[PDB]
């Protein structure tokens, strides 16, 4: 039976900021915070993922206030807190969910210092998380249809011949952001069949801006169920869309590193 | 044993992918997927009539060579060429007896005094993986060298170099969607190119990459695994998210 480790790691999230306890105060009830990722050893930003499905900082539990949308998460003593509120299951989709209440950890504001609330699972960039020490986004060259490269310009995205900008920073919150302006997001406005995906701002952190690279080679919008698609397998159209997964080459991609 | 065909004669990018997709399709039933990553079948409990699959390779010259892949790790254990079979030196003895189930109809089985590991094949071929060019051409010329070694035409260094090509172009491309993509762009432009430090490090990390992902917490590694950019660079991985579009197959190491 597989070994059960308990790694200590930073939980990077919305807009590349990490999971932090406010001000480093560990008294029971203090707010858990969205904060720039540090390069230090202070336990305020390092979290141990224990076997009992609990995220702990300096020995204390990341605890949601209640079991309803809007309540914030506080640091609290693990034994004194309620068992059901101290528990979290981190899914391979980037969300961090609580088994009871069906509420995922959301960051309703990309500003530094946002108290982490817990909201309804709409698979938003606000509620996409990644436990890593790499506190800098992974920047790659995304290659897809016919070997072309995903390129962006001032709000327009398509594929073109791979010229060595075509660079994209894969943020921990599940967003894909053009390198030159990393405040902009790979956004889609609707859960419809041919909504052109382009570059907007990362403010709303909605779904349509959150993407997971599935093992089958696609780039899926988790809330949509449709994948990134070059329209009619035609790069010259300069058009990319969300389309139901069929598996053809015009929706298969690869993050070159 | 299941047989899967490929030919460098008229090989297109799609003719390469469905091949690797068919190889993956028979290397594992896809039943055990852990953290979006599929697992090869467990050596313990696997029937020997399900222990191997065979890939048949042909080329512009219509020379045929059939490789044998160990289902538990997708690595090449041997190959039949016409009337003769050839096997790498087995590591243990349980693997030495399963070899006897492979090419039974042929006359003269052969087992080399060397195993099929990169560092020894690199030693035998006198060249490193970082220098041996990969692509359709190299695979074509390698198919010939495996066929003619039986007739004394192929020498041992060219034999070992052919092994490094096939293993990388088949086994590794099955394990990694990334390395398959590296062979993908080579067919696309008709290139003869040695692999990056990116491909080399992935090949050298596969066993460790499987352990850490399976032995991971529900997502996170207990320890990092350092890798490479296409340009030789520093970067380490701490979670399985970045690896999902990269690793296609994992060796079994433990139970969920």
């Amino acid at each position, epitope marked *: 039976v597989c070994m059960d480790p308990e790694p200590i790691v930073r939980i990077v999230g919305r807009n590349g900021l990490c999971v932090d306890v406010r001000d480093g105060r560990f008294h029971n009830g203090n707010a858990i915070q969205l904060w720039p990722c540090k390069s230090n050893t202070d336990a305020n930003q390092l979290w141990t993922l224990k076997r009992d499905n609990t995220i702990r900082s300096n020995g204390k539990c990341l605890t949601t206030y209640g079991y309803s949308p809007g309540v914030y998460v506080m640091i609290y003593d693990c034994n004194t807190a309620a068992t059901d509120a101290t528990r979290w299951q981190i899914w391979d989709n980037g969300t961090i969910i609580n088994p009871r209440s069906s509420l995922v950890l959301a960051a309703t504001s990309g500003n530094s210092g946002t108290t982490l609330t817990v909201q309804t699972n709409i698979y938003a960039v606000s509620q996409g998380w990644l436990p890593t020490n790499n506190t800098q986004p992974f920047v790659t060259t995304i290659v897809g249809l016919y070997g072309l490269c995903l390129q962006a310009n001032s709000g327009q995205v398509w594929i073109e011949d791979c010229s060595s900008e075509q660079q994209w920073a894969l943020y921990a919150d599940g967003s894909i952001r053009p390198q030159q302006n990393r405040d902009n997001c790979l956004t889609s406005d609707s859960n419809i069949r*041919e909504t052109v995906v382009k570059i907007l701002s990362c403010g709303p952190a909605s779904s349509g801006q959150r993407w997971m690279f599935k093992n089958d080679g696609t780039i899926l919008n988790l809330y949509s169920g449709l994948v990134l698609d070059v329209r009619a397998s035609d790069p010259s159209l300069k058009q990319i869309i969300l389309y139901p997964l069929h598996g053809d080459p015009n929706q298969i991609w690869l993050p070159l590193f | 044993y299941p047989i899967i065909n490929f030919t460098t004669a008229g090989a297109t990018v799609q003719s390469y992918t469905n091949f690797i997709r068919a190889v993956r399709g028979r290397l594992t039933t896809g039943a055990d997927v852990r953290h979006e990553i599929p697992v090869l079948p467990n050596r313990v409990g696997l029937p020997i009539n399900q222990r191997f699959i065979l890939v048949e390779l042909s080329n512009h010259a219509e020379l045929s060579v059939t490789l044998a892949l160990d289902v538990t790790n997708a690595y090449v254990v041997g190959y039949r060429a016409g009337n003769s079979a050839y096997f790498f030196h087995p590591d243990n003895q349980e693997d030495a007896e399963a070899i006897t189930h492979l090419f039974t109809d042929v006359q003269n089985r052969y087992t080399f005094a060397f195993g099929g590991n990169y560092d020894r094949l690199e030693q035998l071929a006198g060249n490193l993986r970082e220098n041996i060019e990969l692509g359709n051409g190299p695979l074509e010329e390698a198919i010939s060298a495996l066929y003619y070694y039986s007739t004394g035409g192929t020498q041992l260094p060219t034999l070992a170099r052919s092994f490094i090509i096939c293993i990388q172009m088949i086994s590794e491309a099955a394990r990694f969607q990334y390395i398959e993509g590296e062979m993908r762009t080579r067919i696309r432009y008709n290139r003869r190119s040695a692999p990056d430090p990116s491909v080399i490090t992935l090949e050298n990390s596969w066993g460790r990459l499987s352990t850490a992902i399976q032995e991971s917490n529900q997502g996170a590694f207990a320890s990092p695994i350092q890798l490479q950019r296409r340009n030789g660079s520093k970067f380490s991985v701490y979670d399985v998210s970045i690896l999902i579009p990269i690793i296609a197959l994992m060796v079994y190491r433990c139970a969920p």
Partner: nanobody
Framework: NAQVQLVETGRLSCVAS???????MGWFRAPKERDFVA???????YYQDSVKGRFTISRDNANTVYLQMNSPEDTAVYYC??????????????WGRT
């Protein structure tokens, strides 16, 4: 050095000189820029926003791909377009001759 000849007729009909490989199919429409109309490899489908439901594009690799027009501003010259990977380019694109 040779290419496919997409000869168009027509229910618009279009044939190639290999569609098995040739990726997708594309119909393009007035004496205005050459806008888009409408299949993937399998293939599936991609229609322009003006002509959803009215138009249907079909495929059968085993060398033809159609386009059925059902139900004035759509009057123009329509061309069938092909895509795929290359051996000559950077990728393959073929326009036809209706």
């Amino acid at each position: 050095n040779a290419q496919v000849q997409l000869v168009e007729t027509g229910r618009l009909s279009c044939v190639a000189s290999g569609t098995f490989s040739s990726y997708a199919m594309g119909w393009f429409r007035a004496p205005k820029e050459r806008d888009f109309v409408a299949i993937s490899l399998s293939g599936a489908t991609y229609y322009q926003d003006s002509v959803k439901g009215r138009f249907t594009i079909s495929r059968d690799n085993a060398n033809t791909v159609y386009l059925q027009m059902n139900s004035p501003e759509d009057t123009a010259v329509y061309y069938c377009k092909a895509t795929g990977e290359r051996g000559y380019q950077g990728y393959l694109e073929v326009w036809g001759r209706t």
